[PDB]
């Protein structure tokens, strides 16, 4: 009864959505996210998880502020008009 | 160096009616269960991947280089060798061809062409001009789109 | 019946309807719709006519 009848019994999420990353990796009872390590300050990352670093890194999102830094540096961090 | 190896494929072993090549794990992807990590495998690493520490430049003795240069200079003065090399020098009075230093002092392309016409190198010029043809392969999109002959060398 | 800012509560909706349409309201009900936007049923007092206010707003 370890196969289909036991799969009939699984309806209790052990992971819900995480605040820091929306990945469904937040362990409810452990209170920690299995992907980003939330609520720890440091984002969870490993040097054996190169693909994971690819998935979660700079340039993967919008870069709402960092994208303009190169332009501002090229112009010398100017203030005026 | 990581081409073909960015997978966690493991061999299934024997007993599963498939070859023993490493296979991609997981499911619901279409790539799971597929062969990996082999030259025979689609998406795998090539056999003996090309390395940058292959020998590119090859050393030659200075004296042998100068021997070859002297032989080439001496061959430039053989009338038959230039024709065999295909340089349209039939109309030239005699070779080696020596022109005054006013040619060194020349300034414009029109008068350079005029000098070539005067001394008989123009035929070589039209050979180069009419030899222009598209390359015969994938060298076109490697910044080698056209081929043409070699004209006179003004020294 | 209004589409309402998702951050607006019943107090704010009542105040805004009163300020915008010069009408006294009797009750406000709200629900977050399955498409994710707030929907407010604002019942006016008997002194006002919702139909007249609607055709004043522009939709009959």
């Amino acid at each position: 009864g370890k196969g289909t009848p036991s799969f009939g019994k699984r309806h209790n999420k052990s992971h819900t959505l995480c605040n820091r990353c929306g990945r469904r990796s937040f362990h409810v009872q452990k209170k920690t996210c299995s992907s980003c390590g939330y609520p720890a300050a440091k984002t969870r990352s490993y040097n054996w998880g190169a693909k994971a670093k690819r998935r979660h890194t700079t340039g993967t999102g919008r870069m709402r502020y960092l994208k303009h830094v190169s332009r501002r540096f090229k112009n010398g961090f100017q203030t005026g008009s | 160096e990581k081409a073909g190896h960015q997978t966690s494929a493991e061999s299934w072993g024997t007993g599963r009616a498939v070859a023993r090549i490493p296979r991609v794990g997981g499911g619901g992807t279409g790539r799971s269960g597929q062969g990996a990590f082999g030259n025979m495998c689609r998406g795998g690493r090539m056999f003996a991947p090309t390395k940058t520490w292959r020998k590119w430049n090859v050393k030659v003795n200075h004296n042998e280089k100068r021997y070859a240069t002297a032989s080439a200079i001496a061959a430039t003065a053989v009338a038959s060798l230039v024709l065999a090399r295909g340089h349209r020098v039939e109309k030239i009075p005699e070779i080696p061809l020596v022109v005054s230093t006013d040619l060194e002092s020349i300034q414009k392309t029109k008068e350079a062409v005029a000098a070539l016409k005067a001394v008989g190198a123009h035929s070589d010029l039209l050979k180069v001009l009419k030899s222009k043809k598209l390359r015969a392969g994938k060298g076109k999109y490697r910044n080698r789109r056209w081929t043409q002959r070699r004209g006179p060398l003004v020294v | 019946v209004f589409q309402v800012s998702m951050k607006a509560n019943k107090y704010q909706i009542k105040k805004a309807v009163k300020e915008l349409y010069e009408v006294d309201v009797l009750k406000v009900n709200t629900l977050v719709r399955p498409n994710g936007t707030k929907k407010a049923y604002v019942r006016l007092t008997a002194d006002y006519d919702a139909l007249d206010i609607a055709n004043r707003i522009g939709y009959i």
């Binding site: 830094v69 961090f77 203030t79 | - | 707003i57 522009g58 939709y59």
Partner: protein
């Protein structure tokens, strides 16, 4: 086309507030009309006009606060410059160019001489 920021800049506080209010009213009415009309591209122009009025008001307010804080140190953080965290933690020109009196005496006594080797 909508309203123009240069002519908006000549208006005063009450004028800009009044323009904002009736622009908001017109946007509301256009939303009502859009509810029934197939396409209504004027709503984009009116929204842009509200953005123009708002940015002019904000520029006036920020310039007034800049005038208020002019001359004194401790500017508000959103009013002072935004170069880079490191570029702000870095020593200023004066602080970097500071040198001790011993090194200053040595530098004035023996500055790198300008010389050429010909004769």
């Amino acid at each position: 086309a909508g309203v123009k920021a240069y002519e908006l800049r000549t208006k005063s506080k009450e004028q800009l507030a009044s323009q904002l209010v009736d622009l908001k009213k017109e946007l509301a009415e256009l939303k009502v009309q859009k509810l029934s009309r197939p396409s209504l591209p004027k709503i984009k122009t009116v929204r842009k006009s509200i953005a123009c009025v708002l940015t002019v008001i904000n520029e006036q307010q920020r310039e007034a606060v800049r005038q208020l804080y002019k001359g004194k140190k401790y500017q508000p953080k959103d009013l002072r410059a935004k170069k880079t965290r490191a570029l702000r933690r870095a020593l200023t020109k004066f602080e970097a160019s500071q040198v001790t009196e011993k090194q200053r005496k040595k530098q004035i006594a023996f500055p790198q001489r300008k010389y050429a080797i010909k004769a």
